[PDB]
């Protein structure tokens, strides 16, 4: 056809065959073609990007400082060749000879409150801040708000915050060498706990593991832990691997077992009545260490927790209770010297000493 009617928001490409230059013609116009001109297609509709959408043009036209299209020494459009442009809301536009619509009209990502876009640089580039970004670099676009797509950047996934409730902590693992929120160094594969209550939005290198629940402690229970590695606990107390200790309510009401601790179990309190005693085997010393092959008599109106490594010789035992007609022949191993024996009699209660052996049980009357 010699006469091409182009509607208001359409365009054509016209190839000049004497100069080889193809250019755009835009409506509204009744276009009449010159002799050495071909019309590449019927008038095609211009690209209109609605507010809150975008598209991507491949081989986008280049423009000067004043944002106006540039043309060759021949008059052919100047493109930025294997490049891309993100095009936002604007008046409808034609595509120029060579320009391609890489991605058609697409809504902008609106990022919600407790979520983030996991971003990754596809190449080395310079930032809005004047900052240099490396190809494999990963970071977050933190919600809320609108994310403007970038040709240099891939959205890997949407990340959702993990809600941490009271008496819970979140266990994280480092995917690579990094620094956590607080700026503490974390090495690859290292694990730790976040204890802040609320939604926790993990950093890109923070792999989200299990939420951990507190063990609630009462006056009647202690938590038996073993150190998995050397650490200093919430109370500023150093432990070394394989060492074991008890956590009680005097320490805290709620204990979240840290990554460094292994739960061995819950120790119920031992209570001795007024006429009861027990013998602790391998009793803990003042230096925190089990005194092996030793024993310690505990008696009579006491409540205690059995410490790690400790055990009771024969459960809870009855004190010797003697009536009027009864007595006890006792030998000293120590006032009396070591070896001599005396009678103790009348009504009484005797608790075994171990610096004295009961030789005889006198019902003699």
Curated annotation (Swiss-Prot):
Ranges annotated as spanning the membrane: none
Signal peptide segment: none
Segments annotated as MVP repeats: 1-52, 53-107, 108-160, 161-213, 214-268, 269-319, 320-364
Modification after translation: Phosphorylated on Tyr residues after EGF stimulation.
Subcellular location per the Swiss-Prot or TrEMBL entry: Cytoplasm; Nucleus
Record note on domains: MVP 3 mediates interaction with PTEN. MVP 4 mediates interaction with PARP4.
Subunit field text: The vault ribonucleoprotein particle is a huge (400 A x 670 A) cage structure of 12.9 MDa. It consists of a dimer of half-vaults, with each half-vault comprising 39 identical major vault protein (MVP) chains, PARP4 and one or more vault RNAs (vRNAs). Interacts with PTEN and activated MAPK1. The phosphorylated protein interacts with the SH2 domains of PTPN11 and SRC. Interacts with APEX1. May interact with ZNF540. Interacts with TEP1.
Function: Required for normal vault structure. Vaults are multi-subunit structures that may act as scaffolds for proteins involved in signal transduction. Vaults may also play a role in nucleo-cytoplasmic transport. Down-regulates IFNG-mediated STAT1 signaling and subsequent activation of JAK. Down-regulates SRC activity and signaling through MAP kinases.
Protein name in UniProt: Major vault protein
């Amino acid at each position: 056809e010699a006469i091409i009617r182009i509607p208001p928001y359409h365009y054509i490409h016209v190839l000049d065959q004497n100069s080889n230059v193809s250019r755009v013609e835009v409506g509204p116009k009744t276009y009449i073609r010159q002799d050495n001109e071909r019309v590449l297609f019927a008038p095609v509709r211009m690209v209109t990007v609605p507010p809150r959408h975008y598209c991507i043009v491949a081989n986008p036209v280049s423009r000067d400082a004043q944002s106006s299209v540039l043309f060759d020494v021949t008059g052919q459009v100047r493109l930025r060749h294997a490049d891309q442009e993100i095009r936002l809301a604007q008046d409808p536009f034609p595509l120029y000879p060579g320009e391609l619509l890489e991605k058609d009209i697409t809504p902008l990502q609106v990022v919600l409150p407790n979520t983030a876009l996991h971003l990754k640089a596809l190449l080395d580039f310079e930032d809005k801040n004047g900052d240099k970004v490396m190809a494999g670099d990963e970071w977050l676009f933190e919600g809320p708000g609108t994310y403007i797509p970038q040709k240099e950047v891939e959205v890997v996934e949407i990340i959702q915050a993990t809600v941490i409730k009271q008496n819970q902590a979140l266990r994280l693992r480092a995917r690579k060498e990094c620094f956590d929120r607080d700026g503490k160094e974390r090495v690859t594969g290292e694990e730790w706990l976040v204890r802040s209550v609320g939604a926790y939005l993990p950093a890109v290198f923070e792999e989200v593991l299990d939420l951990v629940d507190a063990v609630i402690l009462t006056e009647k229970t202690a938590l038996h832990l073993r150190a998995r590695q050397n650490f200093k606990d919430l109370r500023g107390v150093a432990h070394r691997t394989g060492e074991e200790w008890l956590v009680t309510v005097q320490d805290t009401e709620a204990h979240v077992p840290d990554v460094y601790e292994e739960v061995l179990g819950v120790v119920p309190i031992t209570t001795l009545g007024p006429r009861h005693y027990c013998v602790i085997l391998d009793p803990m010393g003042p230096d925190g260490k089990n005194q092996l092959g030793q024993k310690r008599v505990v008696k009579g109106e006491k409540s205690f927790f059995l410490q790690p490594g400790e055990r009771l010789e024969r459960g809870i035992q009855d004190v010797y209770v003697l009536s009027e007609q009864q007595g006890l022949l006792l030998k000293a191993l120590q006032a009396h010297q070591a070896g001599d024996r005396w009678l103790i009699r009348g009504p009484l209660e005797y608790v075994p000493s171990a610096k004295v052996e009961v030789v005889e049980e006198r019902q003699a009357i």
